Amino acid sequence: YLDRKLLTLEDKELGTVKKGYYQMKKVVKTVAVKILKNEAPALKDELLAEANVMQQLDNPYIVRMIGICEAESWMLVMEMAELGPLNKYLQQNRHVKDKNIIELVHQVSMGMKYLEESNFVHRDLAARNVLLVTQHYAKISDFGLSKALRADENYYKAQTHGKWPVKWYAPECINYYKFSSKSDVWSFGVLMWEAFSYGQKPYRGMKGSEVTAMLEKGERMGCPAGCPREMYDLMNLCWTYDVENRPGFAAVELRLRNYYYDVVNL
Ligand SMILES: Cc1nn(-c2ccnc(Nc3ccc4c(cnn4C)c3)n2)cc1CN1CC(O)C1
């Protein structure tokens, strides 16, 4: 639990997320602060659950939580990733090249390999939830929907969902509300499609029910313009319909290593 007197917030928004500076032992640390807007119950509990997940995670490709601050509002204080969301960055930086995008999605795969090993399911793995420290260093963010798996199960059973997250959901999430590291792999495939499409939205112009129907017919998003063929092939493997045959992150990470080195050594 952090001291509000040592935290300064900048006025404008990145409830809300604001840039701040937290006075540590001696130096200031630049932070991003998730601030809960609560004019006037369960909103507080969601923020604390998000914090509880981040507290348990320690990996270079995951956003680090500094702590929680209880003051005028409830606040989740994190280490600042200066460049912000991957989708918005790639939208505004079309100059970014194949190898660089491959480097970044590989880093995400390394963070997700760690999450998988820790038996946590992200449940919201999308390009908007990858933050850039630098142009060559990505971290996974946004653990608000994340769940610690039971010791005796490899999935979490959710309640009925709305329309907004559907485009990143695996068929078993849609049909059975079952979330696993394998469903995170499906989402990662969509994340890759986003990244190599320079932050364009997946399944443009389609409703969730239409996406679900498309996937049930055995159809998948086409190759983004200019996207390396081997990356498109990996997306399709991530979009393996049945959970058992779909790869885990260890496998996805390994195939990202090898092609990264192929591109570096071409
Ligand atoms: C939970 C959370 N942490 N968090 C963080 C955590 C650490 N760093 C940053 N840095 C950062 C830097 C520049 C930014 C943004 C957003 N827009 N811009 C221009 C974020 N954000 C952001 C969020 C909100 N999610 C980011 C997803 O897009 C929504």
Coordinates of N, CA and C in Angstrom, one line a residue, residues 52-175:
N52 N -4.1 -8.0 -7.2 CA -3.8 -9.3 -6.6 C -3.1 -10.3 -7.7
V53 N -3.5 -10.2 -8.9 CA -2.9 -11.0 -10.0 C -1.5 -10.5 -10.3
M54 N -1.4 -9.1 -10.5 CA -0.1 -8.5 -10.9 C 1.0 -8.7 -9.8
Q55 N 0.6 -8.6 -8.5 CA 1.4 -9.0 -7.4 C 2.1 -10.3 -7.5
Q56 N 1.5 -11.3 -8.1 CA 2.0 -12.7 -8.2 C 2.9 -12.9 -9.4
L57 N 2.9 -11.9 -10.3 CA 3.6 -12.1 -11.6 C 5.0 -11.3 -11.6
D58 N 6.0 -12.0 -12.0 CA 7.4 -11.4 -12.1 C 8.0 -12.0 -13.4
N59 N 8.0 -11.1 -14.4 CA 8.6 -11.5 -15.7 C 8.9 -10.2 -16.5
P60 N 10.0 -10.2 -17.3 CA 10.3 -9.0 -18.0 C 9.4 -8.5 -19.1
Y61 N 8.5 -9.4 -19.6 CA 7.5 -9.1 -20.6 C 6.1 -8.9 -20.1
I62 N 5.9 -8.7 -18.8 CA 4.7 -8.3 -18.1 C 4.9 -7.0 -17.3
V63 N 3.9 -6.1 -17.4 CA 3.9 -4.9 -16.7 C 4.0 -5.1 -15.2
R64 N 4.9 -4.5 -14.5 CA 5.1 -4.6 -13.1 C 4.2 -3.6 -12.4
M65 N 3.5 -4.1 -11.3 CA 2.8 -3.3 -10.4 C 3.7 -2.8 -9.3
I66 N 3.7 -1.5 -9.1 CA 4.4 -0.9 -7.9 C 3.6 -1.1 -6.7
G67 N 2.3 -0.8 -6.7 CA 1.4 -1.1 -5.6 C 0.1 -0.4 -5.8
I68 N -0.7 -0.4 -4.7 CA -2.0 0.1 -4.7 C -2.0 1.3 -3.8
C69 N -2.7 2.4 -4.1 CA -2.8 3.6 -3.3 C -4.3 3.9 -3.0
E70 N -4.6 4.0 -1.7 CA -6.0 4.4 -1.3 C -6.0 5.8 -0.8
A71 N -6.6 6.7 -1.6 CA -6.6 8.1 -1.3 C -8.0 8.7 -1.7
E72 N -8.0 9.9 -2.4 CA -9.2 10.4 -2.9 C -10.0 9.4 -3.8
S73 N -9.2 8.6 -4.6 CA -9.7 7.5 -5.3 C -8.8 6.2 -5.1
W74 N -9.4 5.1 -5.4 CA -8.5 3.8 -5.4 C -7.7 3.8 -6.7
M75 N -6.4 3.5 -6.5 CA -5.4 3.6 -7.6 C -4.5 2.4 -7.7
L76 N -4.3 1.9 -8.9 CA -3.3 0.8 -9.2 C -2.1 1.5 -9.9
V77 N -1.0 1.5 -9.2 CA 0.3 2.2 -9.7 C 1.2 1.2 -10.4
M78 N 1.6 1.4 -11.6 CA 2.4 0.5 -12.4 C 3.6 1.2 -13.0
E79 N 4.7 0.5 -13.2 CA 5.9 1.0 -14.0 C 5.4 1.4 -15.4
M80 N 5.8 2.7 -15.7 CA 5.4 3.3 -17.0 C 6.1 2.6 -18.2
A81 N 5.3 2.1 -19.2 CA 5.7 1.7 -20.5 C 5.4 2.9 -21.4
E82 N 6.5 3.7 -21.7 CA 6.3 5.1 -22.3 C 5.6 5.2 -23.6
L83 N 5.8 4.2 -24.5 CA 5.3 4.3 -25.8 C 3.8 3.9 -26.0
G84 N 3.3 3.1 -25.0 CA 1.8 2.8 -25.0 C 1.4 1.7 -25.8
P85 N 0.1 1.5 -26.1 CA -0.4 0.3 -26.7 C 0.2 0.0 -28.1
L86 N 0.4 -1.3 -28.4 CA 1.0 -1.7 -29.6 C 0.1 -1.4 -30.8
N87 N -1.2 -1.5 -30.7 CA -2.0 -1.3 -31.9 C -2.0 0.2 -32.3
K88 N -2.1 1.1 -31.4 CA -2.0 2.6 -31.7 C -0.6 3.0 -32.2
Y89 N 0.4 2.4 -31.6 CA 1.8 2.7 -32.0 C 2.0 2.3 -33.5
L90 N 1.7 1.0 -33.8 CA 1.8 0.5 -35.2 C 0.9 1.3 -36.2
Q91 N -0.3 1.7 -35.8 CA -1.1 2.6 -36.6 C -0.4 3.9 -37.0
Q92 N 0.3 4.5 -36.0 CA 1.0 5.8 -36.2 C 2.4 5.6 -36.7
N93 N 3.0 4.4 -36.8 CA 4.3 4.1 -37.2 C 4.4 3.0 -38.2
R94 N 3.8 3.3 -39.4 CA 3.8 2.3 -40.5 C 5.2 2.0 -41.1
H95 N 6.2 2.8 -40.8 CA 7.6 2.5 -41.1 C 8.1 1.3 -40.4
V96 N 7.6 0.9 -39.3 CA 8.1 -0.3 -38.5 C 8.1 -1.5 -39.5
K97 N 9.1 -2.3 -39.4 CA 9.3 -3.4 -40.4 C 9.1 -4.8 -39.8
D98 N 9.1 -5.8 -40.7 CA 8.8 -7.2 -40.3 C 9.5 -7.7 -39.1
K99 N 10.8 -7.6 -39.1 CA 11.6 -8.2 -38.1 C 11.3 -7.6 -36.8
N100 N 11.1 -6.3 -36.7 CA 10.7 -5.6 -35.5 C 9.4 -6.1 -34.9
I101 N 8.4 -6.2 -35.8 CA 7.1 -6.7 -35.4 C 7.2 -8.1 -34.9
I102 N 8.0 -8.9 -35.6 CA 8.3 -10.3 -35.1 C 9.0 -10.3 -33.7
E103 N 10.0 -9.4 -33.5 CA 10.6 -9.3 -32.2 C 9.6 -9.0 -31.1
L104 N 8.7 -8.1 -31.4 CA 7.7 -7.7 -30.3 C 6.7 -8.8 -30.0
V105 N 6.1 -9.5 -31.0 CA 5.2 -10.6 -30.8 C 5.9 -11.8 -30.2
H106 N 7.1 -12.0 -30.6 CA 7.9 -13.0 -29.8 C 8.0 -12.7 -28.3
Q107 N 8.3 -11.5 -28.0 CA 8.4 -11.1 -26.5 C 7.0 -11.4 -25.8
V108 N 5.9 -11.0 -26.5 CA 4.6 -11.4 -26.0 C 4.5 -12.9 -25.7
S109 N 4.9 -13.7 -26.7 CA 4.9 -15.1 -26.6 C 5.7 -15.6 -25.4
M110 N 6.8 -15.0 -25.1 CA 7.6 -15.3 -23.9 C 6.9 -14.9 -22.6
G111 N 6.3 -13.8 -22.6 CA 5.5 -13.4 -21.4 C 4.3 -14.4 -21.2
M112 N 3.7 -14.8 -22.3 CA 2.5 -15.8 -22.2 C 3.0 -17.2 -21.9
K113 N 4.2 -17.6 -22.3 CA 4.8 -18.8 -21.9 C 4.9 -18.8 -20.3
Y114 N 5.4 -17.7 -19.8 CA 5.5 -17.6 -18.3 C 4.1 -17.6 -17.6
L115 N 3.2 -16.9 -18.2 CA 1.8 -16.9 -17.6 C 1.2 -18.3 -17.6
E116 N 1.4 -19.0 -18.7 CA 1.0 -20.4 -18.9 C 1.6 -21.3 -17.8
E117 N 2.9 -21.2 -17.6 CA 3.7 -21.9 -16.6 C 3.2 -21.6 -15.2
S118 N 2.8 -20.4 -15.0 CA 2.2 -19.9 -13.7 C 0.8 -20.3 -13.5
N119 N 0.2 -20.9 -14.5 CA -1.3 -21.3 -14.5 C -2.2 -20.2 -14.3
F120 N -2.0 -19.1 -14.9 CA -2.9 -17.9 -15.0 C -3.4 -17.9 -16.5
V121 N -4.6 -17.5 -16.6 CA -5.2 -17.3 -17.9 C -5.5 -15.8 -18.0
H122 N -5.0 -15.2 -19.1 CA -5.1 -13.7 -19.3 C -6.6 -13.3 -19.6
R123 N -7.2 -14.0 -20.6 CA -8.6 -13.8 -21.0 C -8.9 -12.5 -21.8
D124 N -7.8 -11.7 -22.1 CA -8.0 -10.5 -22.8 C -6.8 -10.1 -23.6
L125 N -6.2 -11.1 -24.3 CA -4.9 -10.9 -24.9 C -5.1 -10.4 -26.3
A126 N -4.9 -9.1 -26.5 CA -5.1 -8.4 -27.7 C -4.1 -7.3 -27.9
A127 N -3.8 -6.8 -29.1 CA -2.8 -5.8 -29.3 C -2.9 -4.5 -28.5
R128 N -4.1 -4.1 -28.2 CA -4.4 -3.0 -27.2 C -3.8 -3.2 -25.8
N129 N -3.6 -4.5 -25.4 CA -3.1 -4.8 -24.1 C -1.7 -5.3 -24.2
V130 N -0.9 -4.9 -25.2 CA 0.5 -5.0 -25.2 C 1.0 -3.6 -25.2
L131 N 1.9 -3.2 -24.3 CA 2.5 -1.9 -24.1 C 3.9 -1.9 -24.5
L132 N 4.4 -0.8 -25.1 CA 5.8 -0.7 -25.6 C 6.6 0.1 -24.6
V133 N 7.7 -0.5 -24.1 CA 8.7 0.2 -23.2 C 9.5 1.0 -24.2
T134 N 10.0 0.4 -25.2 CA 10.7 1.0 -26.4 C 10.1 0.3 -27.6
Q135 N 10.6 0.8 -28.8 CA 10.2 0.1 -30.1 C 10.6 -1.3 -30.2
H136 N 11.5 -1.8 -29.3 CA 12.0 -3.2 -29.3 C 11.8 -3.9 -28.0
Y137 N 10.8 -3.4 -27.2 CA 10.5 -4.1 -25.9 C 9.1 -3.9 -25.6
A138 N 8.4 -5.0 -25.6 CA 6.9 -5.1 -25.3 C 6.6 -5.8 -24.0
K139 N 5.6 -5.4 -23.3 CA 5.1 -6.0 -22.1 C 3.6 -6.2 -22.3
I140 N 3.1 -7.3 -21.7 CA 1.7 -7.6 -21.6 C 1.1 -6.8 -20.4
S141 N -0.1 -6.2 -20.7 CA -0.8 -5.4 -19.7 C -2.2 -5.9 -19.5
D142 N -3.0 -5.3 -18.6 CA -4.4 -5.5 -18.4 C -4.8 -6.8 -17.9
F143 N -4.6 -7.1 -16.6 CA -4.9 -8.3 -16.0 C -6.3 -8.3 -15.3
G144 N -7.2 -7.3 -15.6 CA -8.5 -7.2 -15.0 C -9.4 -8.4 -15.2
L145 N -9.3 -9.2 -16.3 CA -10.1 -10.4 -16.5 C -9.3 -11.7 -16.2
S146 N -8.1 -11.6 -15.7 CA -7.2 -12.7 -15.6 C -7.6 -13.6 -14.4
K147 N -7.4 -14.9 -14.5 CA -7.8 -15.8 -13.4 C -6.7 -16.8 -13.1
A148 N -6.5 -17.1 -11.8 CA -5.5 -18.1 -11.4 C -6.3 -19.4 -11.5
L149 N -5.7 -20.4 -12.3 CA -6.4 -21.7 -12.5 C -6.3 -22.5 -11.2
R150 N -7.3 -23.3 -11.0 CA -7.3 -24.3 -9.9 C -6.2 -25.3 -10.1
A151 N -5.7 -25.9 -9.0 CA -4.6 -26.8 -9.1 C -5.0 -28.1 -9.8
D152 N -6.3 -28.4 -9.8 CA -6.8 -29.7 -10.5 C -7.5 -29.5 -11.8
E153 N -7.4 -28.3 -12.4 CA -8.1 -28.0 -13.7 C -7.1 -27.2 -14.6
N154 N -7.2 -27.3 -15.9 CA -6.5 -26.5 -16.9 C -7.4 -25.4 -17.6
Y155 N -8.6 -25.1 -17.0 CA -9.4 -24.1 -17.5 C -10.2 -23.4 -16.4
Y156 N -10.7 -22.2 -16.7 CA -11.6 -21.4 -15.9 C -13.0 -21.4 -16.6
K157 N -14.1 -21.6 -15.8 CA -15.4 -21.6 -16.3 C -16.1 -20.2 -16.0
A158 N -16.4 -19.4 -17.0 CA -16.9 -18.1 -16.8 C -18.4 -18.0 -16.9
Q159 N -19.0 -16.8 -16.6 CA -20.4 -16.5 -16.8 C -20.6 -15.9 -18.2
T160 N -21.8 -15.8 -18.7 CA -22.2 -15.2 -20.0 C -21.5 -13.9 -20.3
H161 N -21.0 -13.8 -21.5 CA -20.3 -12.6 -22.0 C -21.1 -11.7 -22.9
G162 N -20.7 -10.4 -23.0 CA -21.2 -9.5 -24.0 C -20.6 -9.6 -25.3
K163 N -20.8 -8.6 -26.2 CA -20.4 -8.7 -27.6 C -18.9 -8.2 -27.8
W164 N -18.4 -7.4 -26.9 CA -17.1 -6.7 -27.2 C -15.8 -7.6 -27.3
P165 N -15.7 -8.7 -26.5 CA -14.5 -9.4 -26.5 C -14.5 -10.6 -27.5
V166 N -15.6 -10.8 -28.2 CA -15.8 -12.0 -29.0 C -14.8 -12.3 -30.1
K167 N -14.3 -11.2 -30.7 CA -13.3 -11.3 -31.8 C -12.0 -11.9 -31.5
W168 N -11.7 -12.0 -30.2 CA -10.4 -12.6 -29.7 C -10.7 -14.0 -29.0
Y169 N -11.9 -14.4 -28.9 CA -12.3 -15.6 -28.2 C -12.2 -16.9 -29.1
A170 N -11.7 -17.9 -28.5 CA -11.7 -19.2 -29.1 C -13.1 -19.8 -29.1
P171 N -13.4 -20.8 -30.0 CA -14.7 -21.4 -30.1 C -15.3 -21.9 -28.8
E172 N -14.4 -22.6 -28.0 CA -14.8 -23.1 -26.7 C -15.2 -22.0 -25.7
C173 N -14.6 -20.8 -25.8 CA -15.0 -19.7 -25.0 C -16.4 -19.3 -25.3
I174 N -16.7 -19.2 -26.6 CA -18.0 -18.7 -27.2 C -19.1 -19.7 -26.8
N175 N -18.8 -21.0 -27.0 CA -19.8 -22.1 -26.8 C -20.0 -22.6 -25.4

